[PDB]
Amino acid sequence: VKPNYALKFTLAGHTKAVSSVKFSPNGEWLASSSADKLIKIWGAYDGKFEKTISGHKLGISDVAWSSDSNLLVSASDDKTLKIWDVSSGKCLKTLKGHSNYVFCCNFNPQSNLIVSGSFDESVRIWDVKTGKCLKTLPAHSDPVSAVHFNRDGSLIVSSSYDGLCRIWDTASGQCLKTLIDDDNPPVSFVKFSPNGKYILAATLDNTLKLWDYSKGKCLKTYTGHKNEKYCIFANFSVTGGKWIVSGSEDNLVYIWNLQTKEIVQKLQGHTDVVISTACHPTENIIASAALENDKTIKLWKSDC
Numbered sequence: 133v134k135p136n137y138a139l140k141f142t143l144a145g146h147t148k149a150v151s152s153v154k155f156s157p158n159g160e161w162l163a164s165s166s167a168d169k170l171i172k173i174w175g176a177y178d179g180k181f182e183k184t185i186s187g188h189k190l191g192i193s194d195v196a197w198s199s200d201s202n203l204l205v206s207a208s209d210d211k212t213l214k215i216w217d218v219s220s221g222k223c224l225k226t227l228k229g230h231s232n233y234v235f236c237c238n239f240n241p242q243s244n245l246i247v248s249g250s251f252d253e254s255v256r257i258w259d260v261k262t263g264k265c266l267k268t269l270p271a272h273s274d275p276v277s278a279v280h281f282n283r284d285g286s287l288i289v290s291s292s293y294d295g296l297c298r299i300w301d302t303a304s305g306q307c308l309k310t311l312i313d314d315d316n317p318p319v320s321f322v323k324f325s326p327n328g329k330y331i332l333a334a335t336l337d338n339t340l341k342l343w344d345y346s347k348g349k350c351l352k353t354y355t356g357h358k359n360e361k362y363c364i365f366a367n368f369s370v371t372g373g374k375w376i377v378s379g380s381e382d383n384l385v386y387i388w389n390l391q392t393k394e395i396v397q398k399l400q401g402h403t404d405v406v407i408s409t410a411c412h413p414t415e416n417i418i419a420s421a422a423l424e425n426d427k428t429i430k431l432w433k434s435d436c
């Protein structure tokens with residue numbers, strides 16, 4: 133019915149706002165990225181600081197794991213992405229081509245491609261092994277807020293401050309569908325559901341929506357949080373109860389029942405906007421991270 137997430141660890145070390153937290157697919161790590169130009173690796177279960185990964189010349193707005201938990205990709209204001217070997221901490225490739233800040237990134241499930249979105253209004257598709265840019269999509273007419281592959285890798289969903297949500301054919305780069313075709317409000321985050329049938333989208337009017345991709349129709353709307361300014365990550369929680377999880381500009385983590393749309397819990401503790409949340413792949417564990425008045429990551433655990 134409702135979860136009982138409670139604060140277990142607070143992870144300190146970043147010196148500017150945290151921008152993104154992500155659990156490794158094998159469950160043992162949390163990665164965090166920050167405006168302080170650093171990636172940090174933490175033990176997922178005990179919050180134990182593991183290492184700092186450094187090399188970007190300006191702040192990092194997103195980081196993402198490969199399917200095998202061995203690689204990270206980061207998106208930076210230095211206009212590049214970097215692919216990192218987590219074990220060594222070494223930068224394997226620097227992905228050059230965007231002409232403005234890189235804001236968002238993800239691997240495909242095969243982990244042979246990286247997709248990126250930028251303030252230059254484009255979506256780029258990159259070959260992981262060579263670091264070459266395979267395609268540049270003129271996807272949007274304002275900064276790109278999120279990019280995500282579906283479960284079989286054949287689709288990319290993108291969102292932008294231009295108000296659009298578009299779905300792209302990975303193989304050809306051509307647009308399959310414009311899911312949201314408004315010019316306002318900004319679409320500040322999007323992500324496929326784990327089975328690839330639905331799309332979770334945030335708009336900067338304090339709204340999250342669950343869309344049916346195939347039918348192009350809105351199935352659920354989630355409200356009650358504060359989101360009018362920042363591109364805040366949102367998540368499907370699937371290890372226990374089926375929830376939607378999101379940060380909020382009132383410094384709380386919100387948890388909703390996916391089916392009934394009722395708020396089931398609000399997690400209090402951060403002292404700034406909760407910009408990023410992540411859900412552990414096998415345990416009922418949430419990671420949350422906050423902006424510059426706070427700069428910490430918090431690990432929360434639930435019995436269900």
Ligand SMILES: COc1cc(CNC(=O)c2ccc(F)c(CNC3=NCCN3)c2)cc(OC)c1
Pocket residue numbers: 150151152192193194235236237275276277278293320321361362363364365407
């Ligand atoms: C007025 O125009 C704007 C204002 C903005 C406002 N900036 C942010 O919300 C922001 C800044 C730094 C971050 F690290 C993060 C968190 N990172 C992240 N979220 C989803 C993928 N990665 C968010 C954005 C924008 O385009 C994107 C255009």
